[PDB]
């Protein structure tokens, strides 16, 4: 078995910026990795394509995944509305870590965040499930449009996404 690789093509106010590819740790968190993989291909009839990064805080992370309410409060998993915290084997060790946003224990939906720094205070509370494989330079460019309160100065969207391998 090989971990799946998924990609997002990012755009800033409709202008293509670049591609970021992620490796998902299906060998350690199969259920969480599968949810993200299926949401990236759009194979269940809904997903990340066309959604945006609604909250970006420089030096911390870029958060996205709300394809429903499109305002930071929505999204859902391929298993229904929410699912359990699979495990917390992996930690928020540095830039590039892919982890799930939530509203407390066992409330995983579709929202996720890409860490741009080590965030150890999130360990044991947020399920880490992948890492940026290529295109970390695109994530750094994205960070430039965020702010301390999270609001972005330009609309950052996932113009296209899918599975590479």
């Amino acid at each position: 078995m090989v971990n799946p690789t998924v990609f997002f093509d990012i755009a800033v106010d409709g202008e293509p910026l670049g591609r970021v590819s992620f490796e998902l740790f299906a060998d350690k968190v199969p259920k969480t990795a599968e949810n993200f993989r299926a949401l990236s291909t759009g194979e269940k009839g809904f997903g990340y394509k066309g959604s945006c990064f609604h909250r970006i805080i420089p030096g911390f992370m870029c958060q996205g995944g709300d394809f429903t309410r499109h305002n930071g409060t929505g999204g859902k998993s391929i298993y229904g509305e929410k699912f359990e915290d699979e495990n917390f084997i992996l930690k928020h060790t540095g830039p590039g870590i892919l982890s799930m946003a939530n509203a407390g224990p066992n409330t995983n939906g579709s929202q996720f965040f890409i860490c741009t720094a080590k965030t150890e205070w999130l360990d044991g509370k947020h399920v880490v499930f992948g890492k940026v494989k290529e295109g970390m330079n695109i994530v750094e460019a994205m960070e430039r449009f965020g702010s301390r309160n999270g609001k972005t100065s330009k609309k950052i969207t996932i113009a296209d996404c899918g599975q590479l391998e």
Binding site: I57, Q63, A101, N102, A103, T107, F113, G150
Partner: peptide, 11 residues
């Protein structure tokens, strides 16, 4: 603060 929540974003 620096949290990543869905619904009630805290300081």
């Amino acid at each position: 603060x620096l949290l990543v929540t869905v619904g009630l974003v805290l300081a």
